[model samples]
Target chain A: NLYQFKNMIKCTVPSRSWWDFADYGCYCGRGGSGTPVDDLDRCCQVHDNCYNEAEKISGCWPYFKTYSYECSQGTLTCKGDNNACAASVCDCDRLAAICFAGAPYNDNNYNIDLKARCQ
Target chain B: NLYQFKNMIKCTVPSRSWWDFADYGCYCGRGGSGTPVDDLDRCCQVHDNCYNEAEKISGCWPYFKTYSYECSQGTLTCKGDNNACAASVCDCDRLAAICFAGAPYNDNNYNIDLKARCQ
Candidate 1:
């Protein structure tokens, strides 16, 4: 079957205990405090555990792609504009979802401590 | 004058002749030619020219901060909502403005060729 022929990427994600009881470290890697310069754009794969960054992006395309095409192909597609997601797996990691204020070790005013737990 | 002592950041902007007639080079450094993964979130510092990723971020913020605080401080603040810009200079370079399709060297189907004028 074509499905079998498809080269599915191995789930490289670490064991649940690897991220469950541990503190996740996430950074936008933009620049100084919060974000960088060119990294300001939003383009990503579906089921990617995505979310808008205080910006007003479409929410429908994201939840819609649930059964639309994410799980079928590795190619993540867009619906209309800049609001949708498709990912390698179910995006069970929930990258942007469980984020919170991150306390940077540098004590930079522009940055905060973040939290992301793998489910 | 304190204004003189404000330690205004040097206009590291390249010589106009450096870009006056050459094919400008710009990359989001994101995985693909379009953008990156975590960078999908719109958390950036500005007067640094900015644009939304086809999402519904605010426009006033970018234009409004024309003289708000972007220039006064290195910190780029957000307005009532998303959609704004602030930068070192007048943000004259217009990063997202002079952009065009990008052709990545690797022939990566997921990449693109981009163009940008320094203004």
Candidate 2:
């Protein structure tokens, strides 16, 4: 997606990895403690909360599997149908990505030291 | 969609109107000429170029129509299927929207004065 975006135009912001399928959190998959100190942290907090919600549904706990997707031109094609578990996880991750994309953070890297300052 | 986004979580940025189906440009439907001065202007420039590409393709020009869509939960349901022209325009608009969402600009409004500064 990042490559395609780049093809579309010169991207001003840094490229980011779509937080790994199952491995998720604010600090590049490293779970953190303490309250959210800023909007970026809050984005992760919301993502974590989304995952928590997804986990509560029956048959929806961690069935996330690695899948390949292709974006030929502007269209996207992914392998396999996304059932309950997969769907929930996709939604959770997509929302997080969207939040991160719009975040005001100057760089892609997160400050782990701030995690220690949480209440 | 904005409503659904608001429901998903607190949005930090201002809400934006999806540039009307046919009304297009860097400055909220008002058209302008000249080279792009910044990333935001470039985004609109790419969009204009995409529209041009869409128009060139056979059977893919100016068939855009007003349509309604529903975002019940995370799923999106629209009124009708998008054919060639519709699809092209949609892809063009969506890519632009994504570009705008990630732009560094602090406000939603564009500075038309900058449009006049272009060569």
Candidate 3:
């Protein structure tokens, strides 16, 4: 019932949620045109807070480092540090893994189930 | 045995190995003092071939992109792109996780158990 990886045992790949689990590299802010709920091909660790209210700009978070944090392709809205909820100026968004038997985004590279217990 | 994540169910976090399931952001080569067996905080997939025989220098792989790949703090060797083995001219190293209920390497950052299997 379990598939042994190089280090762990993967018992099952759950498909409860459509795409709530994503890896946004820890710091989930608002930048890309994506929304707060938009899934990123990265990782995160908490409430998102990266957004803008005046310019209608969502926010940004560089995929690699402390550079740009604007997401033009995705959507984002956080409480200046939350999940783009109460969109603020200093917060960001909060943020996946494999989706199903076949890649969800139609991409094979993302065909594996992510951490089973990530939330 | 399974804890439901926002997306999947996690039965357990295995600590079979001390620290072998490292995440090196994919592409892993020899550049840092870290060896092919080093436990990077990123991820990878394959044999290694990143070394320098002429300069007695190991090869390199950028952490964020296609930059430098020389390790200094850890020790590494590879077949250019194959785990620093055969130490070739165009290879790299192939390549972990929470580790334990308490943690290892004396760092709290690595307290949870890694996957249950890895060899």
Candidate 4:
């Protein structure tokens, strides 16, 4: 009987909401408009926004573990090299830096984790 | 002599720094460690952060013009589909939303532009 109840809960877990999660991901900071030097290479915590000047824009997104990359200098082209362009260049004048998110585990869901990881 | 002087000025412009531009790109907000629902789909202005719970992490990256995507519900699987996993599923339980970056142009470099475009 207990096994059946557990199975029922699993089935009724309800689908996950796309908006439930906060935005967290890597970003190329302040600069002109162009391709991101290290695409998705850097990590950021949930709700941690980033800036890029070359492209002249800003944005926020979600992130997951196992996503990491290094920082370099030059034009972080987001094109060419079979999509690898995003991870190719790094602009120092733009104040480039890699960010990481906190672990996702707790009663409040990943919220606390997000803060812990990012903050 | 006149033509040579003009050429020298152009050359003296100095190479642009990748950091000169702001970070503008999409992200997968708060959820478990997994793939981003809309991989680089949504456009984020510079310096905007996000969160995710499933993958248990977060990150940030740069963005350029012309990057856009839609928002939906369900699991935003970030795998399979010829690297289209990033744009496949949307987890509503995690809070999902698409952001846009402001234009990239101004006197203070892209800083004003970044603010205008993103803020």
Q: Fnat of candidate 4, please?
A: 0.00
Q: Residue-wise lDDT of candidate 1 within B1-119, one digit each (tens)?
A: 11111112212222121111111222332212323211211111111223332113444332223322222333323233322333322232222212211112121211223422111
Give one digit per residue, the lDDT tens place, for model 2 in B1-119. Answer: 22332321222223544332112323333333456555666776777678667766654433232324444443334335766666666556556655666665534234343223432
Could you tell me which residue pairs clash in candidate 2? Answer: none
Local distance difference test, candidate 1: 0.23
Worst 10 residues of 2 chain B by lDDT: B4-13
The 0-to-1 C-alpha lDDT of every candidate, in the order given, reads 0.23, 0.47, 0.24, 0.23
Candidate 2 wrong stretches, greater than 4 Å: A1-14, A17-28, A66-80, A106-109, B1-119
Residue range A1-119, candidate 2, lDDT tens digits: 22222221112223532221112224334455666656766777787788788778786654232223333543334435766666666555555555655765533233234344555
Number of the top candidate by TM-score? Answer: 2
lDDT digits (tens) for residues A9-43 of candidate 4 = 22222232222222222121112222222332232
Per-candidate interface C-alpha RMSD? Answer: 17.1, 15.2, 15.5, 13.2
Listing every candidate in turn, what is its Cα RMSD in Å to the true structure after a full C-alpha superposition?
19.1, 18.5, 18.9, 20.5
Native contacts retained per candidate? 0.00, 0.00, 0.00, 0.00
Cα displacement (angstroms), candidate 2, residue A46, comes to 0.9
True lDDT of residue B119, candidate 1? 11
